[PDB]
């Protein structure tokens, strides 16, 4: 009849909510299909092809909101 | 190997072959030996008679096992650069 089918898992979300151990480069947020949902900021950046919030140097996670027009923005200060 | 019906692990995975067909006739002597090679001179053979190689073997190394003590001189054989030390370090000599 047509109605059916559907994508698979495709997790994508926050895997490093707030401050964490934040190793050399965990994930902090793999919510692909975004740029504004989560913006690359601070010691963390990367933002791979699949819009995955990288996360560089070890430390804690912040989860902020700066710059004109909301804009979440994530980063990882020292701990 | 059977796991329901799906391609078994020993199936989905490739097969990297090729057997030495030589390493089979290549032994590995250790420093713990020699002090039992019936006297001095660790002849290419001897070790065989010393019951520690194999009538078939044709090649072998000395390697570092952690022993030597008695001054011995390996003959008609090979040896690591780490074993060709302790061997001489104990008053030994290399054939080559």
């Amino acid at each position: 009849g047509g109605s059916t089918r559907n994508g698979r898992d495709s997790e994508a979300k926050r895997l490093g909510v707030k401050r964490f151990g934040g190793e050399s480069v965990l994930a902090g947020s793999i919510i692909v299909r975004q740029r504004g949902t989560k913006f690359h900021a601070g010691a963390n950046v990367g933002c791979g092809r699949d819009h995955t919030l990288f996360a560089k140097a070890d430390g804690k996670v912040k989860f902020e909101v700066k710059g004109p027009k909301n804009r979440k923005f994530i980063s990882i200060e020292a701990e | 190997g059977f796991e329901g019906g799906q391609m078994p692990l020993y199936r989905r995975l490739p097969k990297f072959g090729f057997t030495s067909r030589k390493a089979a006739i290549t032994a590995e002597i250790r420093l713990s030996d020699l002090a039992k090679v019936e006297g001095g001179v660790v002849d290419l053979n001897t070790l065989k008679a010393a019951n520690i190689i194999g009538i078939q073997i044709e090649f072998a190394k000395v390697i570092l096992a952690g022993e030597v003590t008695t001054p011995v001189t390996v003959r008609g054989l090979r040896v690591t650069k780490g074993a060709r030390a302790a061997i001489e370090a104990a008053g030994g000599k290399i054939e080559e």
Binding site: - | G1, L9, Y10, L13, P14, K15, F16, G17
Partner: protein, 64 residues
């Protein structure tokens, strides 16, 4: 009678320093042009059995 070894398995596995075996990665011999070199580059080396299927491997190779 002596246990017969699954020849097929003894051609894809090899006991390592210890219990491990380390095998050959799949997806590296067919349609490779449309595959990422980075992907295939991370496929040339070998890798130990996932431990989850290790049990099986240690059955087809009774004399491993």
């Amino acid at each position: 009678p002596k246990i017969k070894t699954v020849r097929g398995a003894a051609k894809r596995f090899k006991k390592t320093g210890k219990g491990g075996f380390k095998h050959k990665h799949a997806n590296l011999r067919h349609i490779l042009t449309k595959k990422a070199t980075k992907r295939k580059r991370h496929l040339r080396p070998k890798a130990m059995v996932s431990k989850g299927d290790l049990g099986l491997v240690i059955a087809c190779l009774p004399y491993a």
